[PDB]
């Protein structure tokens, strides 16, 4: 009955708090529900204080990234999308819209004066049963090369439906596949290189049979080399300061200073000869280099490459068969990088150095000669997501069925459980099951088909036991993806459902929203 908060500090300890949270959640859900299925249309994140910076995106990750809110539940869901995108890729859309539908269920349930803990326990049990059922339906492959390759092709093709690049799916999905082949079973993500060069077409893009570098060369370096013996270095080479300090030159005549200069030139030449004793035809420097070392190298006539990148040099050491060195007393204890030819290439209006016939091909370099910067940015986002999915499906070989197939499978399993369950939970779980039914429904809504007809047909098919039944998105019919080729990652859907479950658990267990008094701005 007495004021206790600071000016600007608010507390809603009634259903108005959940009302505000729910309307914010719905505002989140509808904004992204247009970015799902093969029928999604992209959105614009327009700025006014960011000096008019815009980005077009389809995977709602960036959308929730670029929008804030005062209602803390919407920020909770934004962080949930953050997590989801941190795991694999697309599905943030899925998990967010699913959370919207489940909170709408919660709305309908609270509309009947029910203690939410019953809902919580029932959803716990329903999630346990659904995860068990899906695991029992987990279809696995990789025992055959052709089968596993076709599974990856199906996953990639299905995934490109959710984004723009579908227009050249056959020229993109398959290509991405070979990229993860070049990983050679290594778990690294940071070997694939992303390149954006406006101009040209997405079909004009290609995967080169080698590697490329985008750094300046030294003053006198040859343009082309064959059978390059390659070494990578990280030292001074910038008049190679002695690294010792608290030492001073203190003389009374400048002849000694002249001799010191001559001696430092000689010492630098000694370092150069120390390096050349190993014997190379191509040198790499992660950082800059000075004029006198450049003249010495030109006397040697080798390739010196200056001011490279830490991640890039790590990648190239993985690639060409060498490792970075910093001391050169051992022409015997180092492995040298190897390539067939190192030439010059002009791409876009930027200059690149081309590695052709590299001894190995672990890392990857994907050049995008697209047509606009914004399409380039969204293309790189999409390929990042796709390669993350590819890496994840290479990691765990188990796969699942999309087009609602697994979805209606768990829906029907929860249906039967609720049927054999007494109490409110059952219908709640049934509504929970109904909640799941909304997910493929919205997909059809993206297509704009006969919604209720299709949902009824799928429920009838899954009640009949046809466990491969799905939705045909090419015409609006019901078929088998085993014929069609619509397969997805078991890990992806599994974690989608589990994360959605725990997010619902945490969101439903709220009772009082208290926004602290703003500091200032």
């Amino acid at each position: 009955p007495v004021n206790i908060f600071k000016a600007g500090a608010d507390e809603e300890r009634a259903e108005t708090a959940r009302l505000t949270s729910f309307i914010g959640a719905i505002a989140i859900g509808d904004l992204v529900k247009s970015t799902l299925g093969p029928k999604g249309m992209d959105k614009i994140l327009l700025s006014s204080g960011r000096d008019a910076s815009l980005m077009v995106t389809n995977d709602g990750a960036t959308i929730l990234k670029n929008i804030g809110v005062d209602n803390p539940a919407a920020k909770v869901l934004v962080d949930m999308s953050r997590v989801q995108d941190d795991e694999v890729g697309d599905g943030t859309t899925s998990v967010t819209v699913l959370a919207a539908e489940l909170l709408r269920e919660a709305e309908s349930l609270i509309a009947k004066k029910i203690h939410p803990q019953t809902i919580i326990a029932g959803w716990r049990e329903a999630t346990k049963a659904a995860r068990e059922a899906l695991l029992s339906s987990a279809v696995d492959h990789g025992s055959d090369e052709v089968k596993f390759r076709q599974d990856l092709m199906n996953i990639a093709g299905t995934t490109l439906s959710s984004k723009l690049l579908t227009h050249h799916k056959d020229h993109f999905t398959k290509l991405a596949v070979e990229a993860v082949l070049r990983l050679k079973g290594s778990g690294n993500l940071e070997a694939i290189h992303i390149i954006k060069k406006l101009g040209g077409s997405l079909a004009d893009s290609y995967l080169d049979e080698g590697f490329l570098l985008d750094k300046k060369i030294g003053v006198n370096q040859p343009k082309r080399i064959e059978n390059a013996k390659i070494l990578i270095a990280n030292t001074g080479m910038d008049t190679d300061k002695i690294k010792i300090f608290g030492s001073r030159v203190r003389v009374d005549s400048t002849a000694k200073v002249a001799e010191i200069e001559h001696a430092e030139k000689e010492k630098m030449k000694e370092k150069v000869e120390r390096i050349l004793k190993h014997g190379i035809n191509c040198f790499i420097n992660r950082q800059l280099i000075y004029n006198y070392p450049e003249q010495l190298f030109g006397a040697a006539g080798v390739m010196a490459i200056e001011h490279a990148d830490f991640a890039g040099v790590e990648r190239l050491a993985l690639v060409t068969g060498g490792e970075i060195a910093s001391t050169f007393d051992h022409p015997e204890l180092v492995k040298l990088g190897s390539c067939k030819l190192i030439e010059e290439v002009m791409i876009g209006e930027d200059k690149l150095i081309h590695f052709s016939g590299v001894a190995l091909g672990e890392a990857c370099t994907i050049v995008l000669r697209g047509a606009t910067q914004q399409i380039l940015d969204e293309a790189e986002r999409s390929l990042h997501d796709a390669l993350c999915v590819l890496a994840q499906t290479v990691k765990d070989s188990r796969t699942v069925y999309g087009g609602g197939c697994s979805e209606m499978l768990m829906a029907h399993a929860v249906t039967q459980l609720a049927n054999r369950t007494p109490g409110k939970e059952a219908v709640a779980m049934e509504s929970y099951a109904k909640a799941l039914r909304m997910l493929p429904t919205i997909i059809a809504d993206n297509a704009g088909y006969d919604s209720a007809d299709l949902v009824a047909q799928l429920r009838a098919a899954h009640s009949e036991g046809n466990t491969t039944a799905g939705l045909d998105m090419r015409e609006g019919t019901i078929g088998d993806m085993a014929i069609l080729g619509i397969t997805e990652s078991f890990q992806v859907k599994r974690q989608v459902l589990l994360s959605a479950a725990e997010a619902a658990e945490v969101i439903l267990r709220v009772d009082n929203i208290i926004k602290a008094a703003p500091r200032k701005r």
Partner: protein, 479 residues
Amino acid sequence: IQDGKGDVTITNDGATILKQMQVLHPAARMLVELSKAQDIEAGDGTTSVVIIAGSLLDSCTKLLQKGIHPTIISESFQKALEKGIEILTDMSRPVELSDRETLLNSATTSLNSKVVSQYSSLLSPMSVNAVMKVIDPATATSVDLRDIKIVKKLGGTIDDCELVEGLVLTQKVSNSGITRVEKAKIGLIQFCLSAPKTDMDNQIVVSDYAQMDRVLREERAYILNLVKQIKKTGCNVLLIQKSILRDALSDLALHFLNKMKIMVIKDIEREDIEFICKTIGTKPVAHIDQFTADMLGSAELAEEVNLNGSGKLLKITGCASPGKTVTIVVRGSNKLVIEEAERSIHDALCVIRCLVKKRALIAGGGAPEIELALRLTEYSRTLSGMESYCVRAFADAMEVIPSTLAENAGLNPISTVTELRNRHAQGEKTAGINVRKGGISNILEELVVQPLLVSVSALTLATETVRSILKIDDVVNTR
């Protein structure tokens, strides 16, 4: 064009014009980035491309009131693009880099839309000769613009803008003595001609009165001997790289050089020295011990030259190095005509670069658009459904730009559209719009042509941009 700040600009290329505006609407930004892409890949044609995109947008608007779903609309977009590829391919022809006349026709047609277009009589040789000196007439298929550097100078006239294969230096001889030597010898220095300093601190400490005179004479003799070793080759010109934290030129050494009659120029930028290496073949010297004739070049005649009463600038010409670099001076009334001539020369250069890059020429004027429209109508008639309406919309959209060609040439749009439609509907191709006569005519005798890549990129990027835009459906305000 004028901004909220002091500078002003005059332009006749759509690209830069679009660059000057800044709009808080996403569509305008999208068009600007599309223009940027067309520039980077081609350089010109933005004079039309954005208007073509808007024409396609209005074309698909009517289909949108017709109710066709945006996805099918996009599929029709893709198919129309694919068909237009070969439609363009139809009336092309192979070109040759040996015959100069087609090359000059290409350049001049590129420069029809520039302010200096009447000055093509002098300028057509200039950009072309700039292009040959860069790459070979043999297999190149790759051209760099950074092989060419152009200098801007106020004053003079447009007639004074000239191409030379030599090297021009903006720097001035600090010594007012010897300033012209014919068949002189050229040298470059990286290090600093100054008192010998150490990497760490150096303290020449003094504990006796004789030591001041001793060290002064010793340093004089030291700098003397260094410059003597420099002169040992018999050099006649020395360039000293720009230095920081240390004076690249020594006043005492300046007097020494004045005594030994060698031009002295310092404060040379870090980068284009390699250009100089590419220009005159000279090689840097980073230490006097390194110094040798191997990093010394030869020249015919270099001098600080006057601008007819408008200042002095440094020129170098007549070197035997078969370099692949050039430079052009620009003069005119004020900086505005300078910008106009610069942009026109750049458009010509990029046009010729693309022409040698992708050797395929397509006639401009009116024949391409009308051929597109006719073939695309007869293709639409063959594919009944919502597809047919969309393709007819494509075929009717392409006629917008030639309507402008008629209009802004002081002609009725519809009459010219009808005439071109009739003439090219009778199988009479090569029917180009004549700006001078004021009607449709054989574009071959009109010398109006352009490379295939120009229009190919134009329509391809337009199609993809439109498809992305229709794939865009919602907007949300951010910070």
